[PDB]
Amino acid sequence: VLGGVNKHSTSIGKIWLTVLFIFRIMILVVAAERVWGDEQQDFVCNTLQPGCRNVCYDHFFPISHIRLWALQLIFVSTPALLVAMHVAYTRHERKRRRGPLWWTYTCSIFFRIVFEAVFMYVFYYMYDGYQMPRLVKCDAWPCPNVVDCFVSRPTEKTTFTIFMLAVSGICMMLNLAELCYLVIKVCL
């Protein structure tokens, strides 16, 4: 909350973006330890081959969904943290002894859009959609031929994937609107 206020921030940055960020954190907290807790423990494969469970789970879930969202939240909140420290350092120096603050705030907004876009592209490149399947067919060594494996709670995981994707898309739109608001105001 505190690390989201600047003298150049409009109502969108002060209120709507701050609420959405808290919204994403709250959803992640309630859906991490309980929904994705038994992702590998309850991954059931129809085989007698030792080691097939480990390789098939790792093949279809190279990075867990909750870990991807945790990384995204850390990345998109870094530019806001950098701006706050720069403000304090400048405020300390000014007392001791647009402008520079305008460029730092504008640059932070640009990096928030880039980090938001990159993480959703990685999601689509890696899981080709939002729908988690009930069944996966795995043929990696040492599994013989093709082995059927069954995912834990596919429907609940699909529902939360839609929530995070939708809010992330809304956050990118709000950041874009704020960037356009600052550019046109200084230009015209």
Measure Cα distances from 140 to 72, 145, 147, 154 in Å: 30, 9, 9, 22
Q: How far is the CB of 35 from a second copy (least distance, A)?
A: 27
**143 near 48, Cβ under 8 Å?**
no
What is the CA angle 149-62-23, rounded to 5? 105
Residue from 46, 93, 96, 187 touching a second copy (CB under 8 A): that is 46
Contacts with ligand PTY: how many residues (CB under 6 A)?
A: 8
58, 47 Cβ separation under 8 angstroms: no
What's the closest the beta carbon of residue 122 comes to ligand PTY, in angstroms? 21
Q: Which is nearer to ligand PTY, 152 or 159 (CB)?
A: 159
Q: Min. distance of Cβ 152 from a second copy in angstroms?
A: 17
Of 132 and 147, which CB lies nearer to a second copy in the complex structure? 147
* DSSP character string of 99-117: -HHHHHHHHHHHHHHHHHH
Contact pick of 47, 72, 108, 161 for a second copy (by CB under 8 A): 47
User: DSSP string spanning 151-174?
Assistant: -SSHHHHHHHHHHHHHHHHHHHHH
Looking at beta carbons only, is 129 or 139 nearer to a second copy?
Answer: 139
Instruction: Read off the DSSP letter of residue 133.
Output: P
Binding mask 121-160 toward a second copy (x if CB under 8 A, else -) reads ----------------x------xxxxx------------
Q: Which residues bind ligand PTY (CB under 6 A)?
A: 134, 155, 158-159, 162-163, 166-167
